[PDB]
Amino acid sequence: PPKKVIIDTDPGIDDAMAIFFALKSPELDVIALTTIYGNVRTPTATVNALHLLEFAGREDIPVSEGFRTSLRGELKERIADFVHGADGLGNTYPTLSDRKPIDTFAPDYLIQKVNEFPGEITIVALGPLTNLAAAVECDPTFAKKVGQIIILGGAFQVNGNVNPAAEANIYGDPEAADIIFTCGADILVVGINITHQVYWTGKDLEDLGRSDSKFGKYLYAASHFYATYHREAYDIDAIYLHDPATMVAAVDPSLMTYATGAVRVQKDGICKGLTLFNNSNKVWHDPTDWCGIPPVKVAVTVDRERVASLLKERLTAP
Amino acid sequence: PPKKVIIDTDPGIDDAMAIFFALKSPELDVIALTTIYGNVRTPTATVNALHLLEFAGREDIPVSEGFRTSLRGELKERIADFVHGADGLGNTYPTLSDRKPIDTFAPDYLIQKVNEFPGEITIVALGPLTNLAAAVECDPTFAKKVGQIIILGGAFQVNGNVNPAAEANIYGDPEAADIIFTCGADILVVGINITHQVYWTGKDLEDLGRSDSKFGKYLYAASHFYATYHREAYDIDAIYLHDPATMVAAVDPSLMTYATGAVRVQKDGICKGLTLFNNSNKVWHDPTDWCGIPPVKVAVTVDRERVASLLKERLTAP
Ligand SMILES: [Ca+2]
Ligand SMILES: [Ca+2]
């Protein structure tokens, strides 16, 4: 102990929460941060990630910029700001600096660091799986060299958040998602089916704002825009803790129950970005597209009280 | 009372069970039977349907042959016999018969009978929706003229039976299924999510065989092959009552709880034949492929004890 962690992020209010919680968790050693599109454009994500690490004081942590488009060159310029704001940090508009990313490309850096520490690195994917899929396509030995891949993505036997069928991160790059779910690495999938159970009320956010914590006060300011979205889209006085709940699985995986089986992603619409899990011990009078696919651990149940309490005692502590 | 019923079937051991139960239910008046592919080839389905009505004594009931291929001419010759047998009636090989179908094509007959009795006819679709979709494509006023369409098909937030994503009847013709779920008729969907709750153990089958009922004894003989399939595919000493549970909804719909919303079908693989339901409910910031789609009633919960008891007291009665 502690475990080495690389975080594939698109900051992102919920991403910032997860980044800060990882930096406040002694059981994790944040070795690096890799940026990707999603909530914000890849250059915006880099700017925000560099800024968050400056605020955290952990300036030692390198920031490696990744894919600006999808794996198959689908342009990711011009993206929705109704969830995370124009700046991507809930319209707080921080006074960002001149600090620059580590010039090495994120998939190239991912392969580099995993060969350096085989079976030690735990990649927490908090955005589209493009950077990870590129690393898999580049080096075929990458999948067996990674310690574990904790993915925030998918809607397992539940409706999606982008459209009724798909979840954001998977809808971002369905080709890249299918590559990862089939790559054969130690994979832990945290879908919206379980993140929708982990939420913080207006009072929980208020408690974080009132707290004498540098991070708690910061996150409360960014939360305002994210809270107004949930209030108009889901009509709830609470925010779903997507990315920070995924970070909890890296800290303590005992707080979740997992089901082992194969996961496949539909790449073409209407159901583009749909994640389908096969935990059906019916296996299978004629082979299916889930037959002979490496199994992955998919989170089924959460200890919502213990997850939300840990993501508070850490973010409220001075 | 009673309600006029047309049954779109592919007999089929479970289909035979539903046919017999409908013929033993005084609240339903089986006006006609329309054949389709699925478990068996369309000509085989016709032969079996004519035979079942002969055995039931109800020779007055016309049999109208339908589509031999999918709606878009996808050939349905050469189909799996591991579930219903070579004959389609659990390898019992009955002593059929020179009786012939009513020369009118099933979609043509469906439009004819619905114009004859508008808002009276209840179509119970126990096979692929090809015959019904052709009727919708032919006459646009058909959807509003039908009394109700009770569909056995789909896997709503659960794994499929053909492959982990799709259910048999919907996988048979995904184009036809999407036409029906969008047609705007009074639709009641009974998916495998609820039929997997309604099952009969080996003892239940034994009770049906021991019974002094013509139908019960017949169904027990055909059940042997269907039972051996469930024992090797699902590894259970029970058979899922798919088609007969759908017939129960026609008899007494109170035994099921329904959710109103839009249903769309994925036509191209990996998730070909997937049925996706949108709770409606749901506020969507940007229109989706479920927005502006006519809502349908989807069965959520069953009274498994009362469904299996009714499908026994009727099939055991002499
Ligand atoms: Ca994210
Ligand atoms: Ca059937």
Contact B177, B170 (CB under 8 A): yes
**Can you read off the two tokens belonging to residue A286?**
């004629």
With contacts defined as CB-CB under 8 Å, which chain A residues touch B282?
159, 164
Q: Do A158 and B163 touch (CB under 8 A)?
A: no
> Is A279 part of the contact surface with chain B (CB cutoff 8 Å)?
yes
With contacts defined as CB-CB under 8 Å, which chain A residues touch B274?
266, 271, 274, 276
Contact B249, B255 (CB under 8 A): yes
CA separation for the pair A260, A295 (Å, rounded): 6
The whole-angstrom distance between residue A50's C-alpha and the CA centroid of its chain comes to: 17
State the distance from the centre of ligand 1 to the C-alpha of A9, rounded, in angstroms: 6
Residue A253, C-beta contacts closer than 8 angstroms, at least 6 positions apart = A188
Looking at the DSSP bridge assignments, the partners of residue A262 are A278
Phi and psi (nearest 5°) for A303? Answer: -100, 65
Q: Which candidate from B164, B266, B277 shows the least CB-CB separation from A288?
A: B164
Query: Resolution in angstroms, to 1 decimal, for this deposition?
Result: 3.3
Residue B242 appears among annotated catalytic residues:
yes
In order of A5, A63, A116, A236, the CA distances from A119 in angstroms are 11, 22, 10, 41
Contact A166, A271 (CB under 8 A): yes
Shortest CA gap A60–chain B (Å): 40
Q: Do B289 and A270 touch (CB under 8 A)?
A: yes
Three-state DSSP class for residue A113 = helix
> Radius of gyration of chain A from Cα atoms?
18
CA separation for the pair A125, A151 (Å, rounded): 5
Looking at the DSSP bridge assignments, the partners of residue B298 are B189, B259
CA separation for the pair B115, B121 (Å, rounded): 10
> Is B271 part of the contact surface with chain A (CB cutoff 8 Å)?
yes
Domain locations along chain A: 1-318
CA separation for the pair B63, B46 (Å, rounded): 7
Residue B196 appears among annotated catalytic residues:
no
**Can you read off the two tokens belonging to residue A269?**
């619409």
Could you tell me which chain A residue has the CA closest to the CA of B276?
A165
Do β-strands A3-9 and A28-35 pair in parallel, antiparallel, or remain unpaired?
A: parallel
Question: For residue A243, which ligand has an atom nearest its CA?
Answer: 1
Phi and psi (nearest 5°) for B270? Answer: -60, -35
CA separation for the pair A68, B90 (Å, rounded): 58
> Is A78 part of the contact surface with chain B (CB cutoff 8 Å)?
no
Residue in A84, A157, A163 to test binding to B, most B beta-carbons within 10 Å: A163
Torsion angle (degrees, nearest 10) of CA A210, A216, A221, A223 = -110
Contact B248, B260 (CB under 8 A): no
Contact B35, B126 (CB under 8 A): no
Contact B170, B273 (CB under 8 A): yes
With contacts defined as CB-CB under 8 Å, which chain A residues touch B277?
164
Phi and psi (nearest 5°) for B192? Answer: -65, -15
Contact A272, A165 (CB under 8 A): yes
Phi and psi (nearest 5°) for A25? Answer: -100, 110
Q: Is the dihedral of CA A2, A30, A170, A314 positive or negative?
A: positive
Shortest CA gap A115–chain B (Å): 34
Residue whose tokens read 């004594």: B57
Three-state DSSP class for residue B137 = helix
With contacts defined as CB-CB under 8 Å, which chain B residues touch A234?
283
> Is A196 part of the contact surface with chain B (CB cutoff 8 Å)?
no
What single string gives the DSSP state of each residue in B74-115? Answer: -B--S---TTT-SSSSTT-----------SS-HHHHHHHHHH
> Is A291 part of the contact surface with chain B (CB cutoff 8 Å)?
no
CA separation for the pair A158, B278 (Å, rounded): 10
B44 DSSP assignment: H
What single string gives the DSSP state of each residue in A5-44? Answer: EEEEE---HHHHHHHHHHHT-TTEEEEEEEE-SSSS-HHH
State the distance from the centre of ligand 2 to the C-alpha of A190, rounded, in angstroms: 36
Q: Do A274 and B279 touch (CB under 8 A)?
A: no
CA separation for the pair A226, A83 (Å, rounded): 6
Question: Which of B250, B183, B231 lies closest to B27 in space, CA to CA?
Answer: B250
Neighbours of B184 (CB within 10 A): 15
CA separation for the pair B24, B5 (Å, rounded): 13
Three-state DSSP class for residue B119 = coil
B54: left (phi over 0), alpha (psi -120 to 50) or beta: alpha
CA separation for the pair A75, A69 (Å, rounded): 5
Amino acid letter for position B44: T
Looking at the DSSP bridge assignments, the partners of residue A5 are A30, A122
CA separation for the pair A8, A123 (Å, rounded): 7
Contact B199, B241 (CB under 8 A): yes
State the distance from the centre of ligand 2 to the C-alpha of B212, rounded, in angstroms: 26
Residue A237, C-beta contacts closer than 8 angstroms, at least 6 positions apart = A201, A202, A231
Task: Check the annotation: does A14 bind a ligand.
Answer: no
> Is A281 part of the contact surface with chain B (CB cutoff 8 Å)?
yes
A205 DSSP assignment: H
CA separation for the pair A125, A120 (Å, rounded): 16
State the distance from the centre of ligand 1 to the C-alpha of A189, rounded, in angstroms: 14
**Can you read off the two tokens belonging to residue B184?**
């705007």
With contacts defined as CB-CB under 8 Å, which chain B residues touch A286?
80
Q: How large is the angle between the packed helices A304-316 and A202-210, nearest 10 degrees?
A: 20
The CATH code of the domain at A1-318 is: 3.90.245.10
Type and span of the H or E element at B224: helix B214-233
A window 145-174, beta carbon within 8 A of B: 157-159, 163-165
CA separation for the pair A153, A172 (Å, rounded): 10
Q: Do A164 and B290 touch (CB under 8 A)?
A: yes
**Can you read off the two tokens belonging to residue B7?**
């049954």
Question: Which of B160, B166, B176, B133 lies closest to B271 in space, CA to CA?
Answer: B166
Question: Which of B129, B113, B48 lies closest to B86 in space, CA to CA?
Answer: B48
CA separation for the pair B121, B140 (Å, rounded): 17
B257 DSSP assignment: E
Cis peptide before A278 (omega within 30 of 0): no
Q: Do A276 and B82 touch (CB under 8 A)?
A: no
Phi and psi (nearest 5°) for B73? Answer: 65, 25
Residue whose tokens read 């908090």: A126
For the stretch A209-216, contacts whose Cβ atoms lie closer than 8 Å and that sit 24 or more positions apart, written own/partner, are A211/A315, A211/A316, A211/A318, A212/A318, A213/A315, A213/A316, A213/A317, A213/A318, A214/A55, A214/A318, A215/A20, A215/A23, A215/A24, A215/A56, A215/A315, A216/A315, A216/A316
Question: Which of A201, A314, A306 lies closest to A257 in space, CA to CA?
Answer: A306
Do β-strands A199-201 and A238-240 pair in parallel, antiparallel, or remain unpaired?
A: antiparallel
First to last CA, chain A: 24
Q: Which candidate from B234, B269, B276 shows the least CB-CB separation from A282?
A: B234
Three-state DSSP class for residue A63 = strand
Task: Check the annotation: does A252 bind a ligand.
Answer: no
Structure determined by: X-ray
Residue B141, C-beta contacts closer than 8 angstroms, at least 6 positions apart = none
Contact B308, B200 (CB under 8 A): yes
B262 CB-side CA count, 13 A: 18
Question: Which of A237, A240, A246 lies closest to A299 in space, CA to CA?
Answer: A246
**Can you read off the two tokens belonging to residue B74?**
């996808």
Task: Check the annotation: does A268 bind a ligand.
Answer: no
